Structures are given as structure tokens and as C-alpha cells.
Design a protein around this motif. Sequence first.
Motif, PDB file in Angstrom:
ATOM      1  N   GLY A 103     -10.102  13.497  -3.451  1.00  0.00           N
ATOM      2  CA  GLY A 103      -9.611  12.792  -2.282  1.00  0.00           C
ATOM      3  C   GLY A 103      -9.191  11.386  -2.655  1.00  0.00           C
ATOM      4  O   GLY A 103      -8.305  11.203  -3.495  1.00  0.00           O
ATOM      5  N   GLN A 114      -4.138   4.555 -13.732  1.00  0.00           N
ATOM      6  CA  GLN A 114      -3.523   3.333 -13.218  1.00  0.00           C
ATOM      7  C   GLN A 114      -2.351   2.888 -14.097  1.00  0.00           C
ATOM      8  O   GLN A 114      -1.288   2.534 -13.597  1.00  0.00           O
ATOM      9  N   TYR A 117       0.843   5.112 -13.795  1.00  0.00           N
ATOM     10  CA  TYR A 117       1.703   4.756 -12.671  1.00  0.00           C
ATOM     11  C   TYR A 117       2.324   3.375 -12.802  1.00  0.00           C
ATOM     12  O   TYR A 117       3.464   3.173 -12.399  1.00  0.00           O
ATOM     13  N   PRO A 140       6.824   0.970  -5.796  1.00  0.00           N
ATOM     14  CA  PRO A 140       5.867   2.076  -5.771  1.00  0.00           C
ATOM     15  C   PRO A 140       6.162   3.104  -4.686  1.00  0.00           C
ATOM     16  O   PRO A 140       6.206   4.304  -4.961  1.00  0.00           O
ATOM     17  N   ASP A 141       6.378   2.637  -3.458  1.00  0.00           N
ATOM     18  CA  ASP A 141       6.678   3.523  -2.340  1.00  0.00           C
ATOM     19  C   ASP A 141       7.929   4.325  -2.626  1.00  0.00           C
ATOM     20  O   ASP A 141       8.002   5.515  -2.320  1.00  0.00           O
ATOM     21  N   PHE A 144       7.188   7.077  -5.052  1.00  0.00           N
ATOM     22  CA  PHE A 144       6.408   8.080  -4.334  1.00  0.00           C
ATOM     23  C   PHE A 144       7.251   9.012  -3.467  1.00  0.00           C
ATOM     24  O   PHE A 144       7.108  10.237  -3.536  1.00  0.00           O
TER      25      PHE A 144
ATOM     26  N   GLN B 156      -4.703  10.893  -4.349  1.00  0.00           N
ATOM     27  CA  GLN B 156      -4.996  10.025  -5.483  1.00  0.00           C
ATOM     28  C   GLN B 156      -3.749   9.262  -5.913  1.00  0.00           C
ATOM     29  O   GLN B 156      -3.828   8.086  -6.268  1.00  0.00           O
ATOM     30  N   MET B 157      -2.597   9.921  -5.872  1.00  0.00           N
ATOM     31  CA  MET B 157      -1.357   9.266  -6.261  1.00  0.00           C
ATOM     32  C   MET B 157      -0.976   8.188  -5.243  1.00  0.00           C
ATOM     33  O   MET B 157      -0.525   7.107  -5.611  1.00  0.00           O
ATOM     34  N   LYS B 158      -1.156   8.498  -3.963  1.00  0.00           N
ATOM     35  CA  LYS B 158      -0.842   7.563  -2.890  1.00  0.00           C
ATOM     36  C   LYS B 158      -1.729   6.327  -3.027  1.00  0.00           C
ATOM     37  O   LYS B 158      -1.244   5.200  -3.051  1.00  0.00           O
ATOM     38  N   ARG B 159      -3.027   6.560  -3.155  1.00  0.00           N
ATOM     39  CA  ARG B 159      -4.010   5.494  -3.286  1.00  0.00           C
ATOM     40  C   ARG B 159      -3.672   4.529  -4.432  1.00  0.00           C
ATOM     41  O   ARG B 159      -3.648   3.307  -4.249  1.00  0.00           O
ATOM     42  N   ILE B 160      -3.412   5.085  -5.613  1.00  0.00           N
ATOM     43  CA  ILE B 160      -3.086   4.268  -6.773  1.00  0.00           C
ATOM     44  C   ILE B 160      -1.731   3.565  -6.644  1.00  0.00           C
ATOM     45  O   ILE B 160      -1.597   2.389  -6.986  1.00  0.00           O
ATOM     46  N   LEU B 161      -0.735   4.287  -6.142  1.00  0.00           N
ATOM     47  CA  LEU B 161       0.603   3.739  -5.999  1.00  0.00           C
ATOM     48  C   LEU B 161       0.814   2.700  -4.913  1.00  0.00           C
ATOM     49  O   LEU B 161       1.284   1.605  -5.207  1.00  0.00           O
ATOM     50  N   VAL B 162       0.493   3.026  -3.665  1.00  0.00           N
ATOM     51  CA  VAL B 162       0.714   2.071  -2.588  1.00  0.00           C
ATOM     52  C   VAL B 162      -0.537   1.384  -2.061  1.00  0.00           C
ATOM     53  O   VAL B 162      -0.468   0.607  -1.110  1.00  0.00           O
TER      54      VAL B 162
END
Lengths: 188, 186
Positions: A103, A114, A117, A140-141, A144, B156-162
Motif C-alpha cells: 500500500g 526513490q 524515480y 513527477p505528475d 505518472f 507506492q509509485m504515486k506516494r514516491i512520485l507526487v
Amino acid sequence: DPEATKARIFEAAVAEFARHGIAGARIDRIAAEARANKQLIYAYYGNKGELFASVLEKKMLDLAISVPVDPDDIEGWIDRLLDYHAAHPELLRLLFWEGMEYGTAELPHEAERQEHYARKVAAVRDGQERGVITDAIPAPDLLFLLVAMANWAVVVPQMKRILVGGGDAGTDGLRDSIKKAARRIVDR
Amino acid sequence: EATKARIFEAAVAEFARHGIAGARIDRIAAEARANKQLIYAYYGNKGELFASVLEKKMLDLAISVPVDPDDIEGWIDRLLDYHAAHPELLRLLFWEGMEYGTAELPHEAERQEHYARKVAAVRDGQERGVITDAIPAPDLLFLLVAMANWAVVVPQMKRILVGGGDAGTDGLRDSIKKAARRIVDR
């Protein structure tokens, strides 16, 4: 080379994690499938969590090296990304299981993730600073959302099939839409 | 608060965490305080049970947040709100995708109509020139949905990225809307 014990465990681990996820994965099965004793798995990877983290990290490095984020060729980057996933479906599958297992909690190899990314984001930012891609949306957004459109179909193949139809005419048609959408998003 | 309602709820919870193949009817029966035979009396079999449960959650979302071409940004807001408030839907949808892949679904026909309606709403917007037609209606709907839901697949990707927490969530929301506009703007 492929006969080395570490390599056999690695491959068996991938297959097992891909089917059952982290919690449902069985070390015994991995051992049996790899024709390696259970203790050998722990000798090479310490524990199930470390094993998954290692296996996932490697597949990600492979994709990162094969398909770097390229702001000067968004469309070409998208093509290569789609090609890679079709050729190596284990990556996204493992990524999904990880998301479901952890999660929003810290990852075993948090620091390494980290950096992973930070590098991709940097590629996007560089493109913004050079004005080749919009800066209306943060780097970043932006990365994504582009990734979201490229991988969504893998998560819900039933939705894709029903909305754009099966057959190459749909896959190819979708690929074209993804690229047109990516362009409208990063333009200016 | 009948038993059919208890089974439904237990089925949701069970399918949500173990998926279709990993779901156990005994567990659903125990959690629903209902005999195993009762589950088959009301839903026939595990596959029918899943299809029924999923179909219901989707009808709920469909009625609560219709595809609206005349307010793409408001539509996105409502979509994000709903998933945050009802995370079972997306979870079930993922399990389904993993279970059936590209194979025909138990309630294939009903699913087809489901999408044909959403597609129609986007088409209508194209025909009226409120939304671009450079991209086909179906594909257009798909891509918009992709941006809206990807974060739930890889938290996990969302958390780290934004960024994690409300700051990250609210930032991605704004980006999603800005991106959606650039995509649909005629």
C-alpha cells in the motif's frame, strides 16, 4: 550460467511471485521449481521479502536501461514502453502485487526505489526546462499520468477488450490513441 | 439485513482480498453466518457470485457518476471521490482482469452494454463538438479512466512520485484534471 543455482531461484521466484503475489507465494514451491533446497534460497536472498524486492528491482533496472524516459521523443518512448511490457509481462504483474501488499508503507528497498524515480523525473524536468514539454503540470505528475495511460490496459484487459475490441486493430488503434493523448498533454 | 445481503457483503470482502480463484466459499459462508448451500441457492456458483457482486458495484458507480462530456473536470472529481469512498470496485475489477484476461466474461452481454452507454456519452459530446474527435470515443474514455485510476493500482509509485498524504493526493487530482482538459479540448 542459466544453470547456476542463484539464477534458477531467481527465475522460479519471478514465476511464483507473478502468480501468487508476496503473501501467497510459497518458498517451498520456489525451491521445488528451482530444484534447489529451501535453505539455499535464504542463503542467496535472506528472506521472502528481500527475495521479492531483489527480483522486482532487477526487472525494473532492465526496463529502465532498455527504455529511458525521453522527453525529446515522447511517442517513440511510448512505443518502446508498450513493446517492452508486451514482451515482459512479469514486471507490471509484480508491481501490482507490491502495491497491494505494501500500500503506502515504506518499501524494503525504499532508498533504491526513490533514486529510480528521481532519475526518471529528472529526465522529464530536463525536457521542461528546455521547453520541449509543457511545464503546466509538474514533472513527477506528468510522468505518472503518461505511465498510467500506457499501462492501464494491462490492469484491466477485459475493459480494454470490450471498449476497443480484441484483435490487432484494437491494440494498434489504442497505441495510436495513447500517443495522440500523450502529445496533447505535453505540448507547448 | 436478510441473508442474501449478508452473503453479498461477505462475498465482497472475500473477493476483495483473495480474488476469484483464491476466494473460499466456506470463508464467505462463515463470515456471513450462512450455510454454504444458501450461497449456491442465491447465486448458483462462485463465478456467478463474483459476476453478480461486481456488476452491482459498477451499476452503483454508473448511476452515481455518469460520464459527462460537458463537465469533464467535475466528472473526474466525482470519479475520484467515489473510488476513495468505495475502494472495493477497482479492487474487484483488477482481480477480474487477472482471472479472465481477454476471455469472455460470465455476464459478457451486460458488460458490453455497460460500456456502450459510457461510450455513447462521450460520442455525444464529440458530435456536439464539446470534446475533441481526434481520438475515438472509446479510446478517449479509456485513457481518461486510466489517469483517474492508475494511482490505486500502484500506491507506492504515486506516494514516491507526487508525495504521500493529502498533499500528494490533491496535487495529482489537479494534474489529472489539467491533463484531461488538454486531451479533450477541441
